[PDB]
RNA sequence: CCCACCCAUACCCCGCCCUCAGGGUAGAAACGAUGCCCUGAGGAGUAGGCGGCCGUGGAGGUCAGUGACGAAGCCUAGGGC
RNA sequence: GACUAAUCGAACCAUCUAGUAGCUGGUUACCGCCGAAGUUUCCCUCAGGAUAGCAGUGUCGACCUUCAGUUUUAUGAGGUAAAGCGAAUGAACUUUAAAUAUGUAAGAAGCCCUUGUUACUUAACUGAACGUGGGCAUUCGAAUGUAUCGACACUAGUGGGCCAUUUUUGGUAAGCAGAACUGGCGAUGCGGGAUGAACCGAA
RNA sequence: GAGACCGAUAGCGCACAAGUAGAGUGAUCGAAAGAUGAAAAGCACUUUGAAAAGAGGGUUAAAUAGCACGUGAAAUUGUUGAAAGGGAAGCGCUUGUGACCAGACUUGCGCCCGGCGGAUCAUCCGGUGUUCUCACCGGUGCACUCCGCCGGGCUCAGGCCAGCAUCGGUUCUGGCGGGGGGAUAAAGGCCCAGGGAAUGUGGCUCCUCCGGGAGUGUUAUAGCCCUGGGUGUAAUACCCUCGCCGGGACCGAGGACCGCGCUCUGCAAGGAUGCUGGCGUAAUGGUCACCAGCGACCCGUCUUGAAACACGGACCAAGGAGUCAAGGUUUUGCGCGAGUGUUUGGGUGUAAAACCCGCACGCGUAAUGAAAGUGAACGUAGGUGAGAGCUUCGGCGCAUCAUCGAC
């Protein structure tokens, strides 16, 4: 016998999505290839967040994007691996280039009306395969009723 | 695919240590001591050794 | 006090199973990528917790499925996984 | 307290009614991965409760910072053995110093200096506290090990059991009775003690 | 009129002369029980029996369907066949015997000759299709070219069990040649020079049983002990160590090459090949029954810490116990998103489906207070320290945490 005071630890992170979305499966295959064949940490972060569940992908609004676009970030490509929502409190949308998992209809319309560009994550992989000149944004994770009641 | 003991397989010993053939050839495991007449044990050493 | 000897699921070497971990795999002559290849470690278990599979009655789809030249059921010191 | 259709300290029939039980009994395929526990702390006890601790699944965060039932070093406790008193003095003597285990501490997240304030404190701008600025990366300041991280969420059993070595406190005619740590068992097969909850070896 | 309901121990108690038969004075209680065959064709006739029935012989597609009737399981029983048994059997590991079996194999592919039978040989031309350079179809082959078939020969690969040789991996065991160390072993032999003694050799003396005793004294007609020296760096033991040669056992994972190497025409170097024999079937292997050696308590359940006690279990078949609804909560998937929810209802329909519509309403978008009421930006929605990612390499800094501020 071998005395094992310590225990070998099985993985406590997602290795694959629980979702059955076929397009998400194709995106996961593409970003698995990118994370394997590139040095860019952006690709690994994007792959890991593609694995994530919905409460771990809180929505990001246009006002949050506009806040993070200030101070030299106006020309960077905004990357969100959640839903980009519209904020009607923001009356003037700045010109921006946003790549997201999905957009609401009003957010897409307001970005295109302000003159920015809307992309999917496979288009982001085509144009910035190393994540160059990107601004990676996450939504407020703790802004949930369950988290308030914890 | 298979660990081979270099103490039994002479090819593996030559792979790990190219000086093994020179060791065996020059017989460095059978080096004789330097010549010269050995001085005898001093008398006081034997007296202390056999002292009751 | 000394020499040799006997054998445990313990220890050493080797094979096989499973689990865990770490790697490789697209200008695809290219893959049940939910796959395949390489390497290492580990294996008792009540209360309890989790995962994967097997089986039964019925429903949708499908196999241009089986069947009076014998369906289902039943018996079987007959076999295969 | 007899008898009232084999029914009587309150007959028989149907219904409410599938009445209630904390007590008894039972509770249905396989394999794989983990895997336990008995005063910790509080509450008036028994016909008592929570609660710490120990477990499993999910995740997430830079799985980042390192940490550790261990030794060493410095210093405590145990000065207790011991050596000497041609050192002084006389376990209570001391230059020196035991064994077993044992507390505390051992870095850049650190150390020191300087400036002010103080509503602390001090005779006191004095200490200390709070800020301010600066210096110290020339080695980041023992060893050994390090698939050993952290934070949530949800779920589950057990939470005043038995035996034993040691330490300690009491006792008896003799038995013995309390605590503390540790190990084992309840949950566990194997080799040996012919045999077997508590023995030896080994999981 | 229907069903993602039940299928005769189910479904109503009742699929049947079922609220019947039966029970109770009565109020009331209350079952069991479906299936020959397509058609009775439900066995003429003969024979044995008192009869029931039996045997022949028909009927049938089938009586292995005979009004005991579709199928006909188990418990349990009879006969036949095989086997075991000295106060239980059953079970596990492993042989053996007997009985009974599943595979595998029967030859394949490829070259060289000879004999046939045919031209869907190569090239070129035209048409068509394609992946746009590859193919298909028609003409040309005129037989040293293609395609089949038949006879020979040869190589390779082929089933089961084995033997030997050369290797690799692991391991057990025997022998041999060297090196080093210590008091450069200690001893010991043979010499040299000193010293000494008794369990005193020779000699001498005295007693005897004539066998031997006693005494004296230092090598003599034996020897011993102690010290120092030489041979001598002697040998050997013990310990440590470098190699060499045998004898035996178990195993052969992988499957083009790649690598590290070496003794380099090649190899023992990132894992077994080569040669040979018998057999080709129950021979190997497997299943069942039994004997033999060793191993092996009767299952739940309860209790406590555990045992013991206690309780349940004669046997077999069929049922037989964490379900549904409402309301929470956390997590997973999905749609839309500051909104979201068509289905109370209306429209429509191939009619309980599907499709479509919208007012209100619910929840969310604002909180706080008992209430009256009031009601969220000093600042690029603040400062500081961390922080993934990005960066023009100066910094920008997500989520999140800590702290100080603002409303």
UniProtKB/TrEMBL annotation, chain A:
Keywords: Ribonucleoprotein, Ribosomal protein. Residues 1-150 form the Large ribosomal subunit protein uL15/eL18 domain. GO terms for molecular function: RNA binding; structural constituent of ribosome. GO terms for cellular component: cytosolic large ribosomal subunit. One of its GO terms (biological process) is translation. Belongs to the eukaryotic ribosomal protein eL18 family. This is Ribosomal protein L18-like protein. It comes from Chaetomium thermophilum (strain DSM 1495 / CBS 144.50 / IMI 039719).
Automatic annotation (TrEMBL), chain B:
It comes from the Eukaryota. Residues 31-52 are annotated as: Disordered. Coiled coil: none annotated. Belongs to the universal ribosomal protein uL4 family. This is 60S ribosomal protein L4-like protein. It comes from Chaetomium thermophilum (strain DSM 1495 / CBS 144.50 / IMI 039719) (Thermochaetoides thermophila).
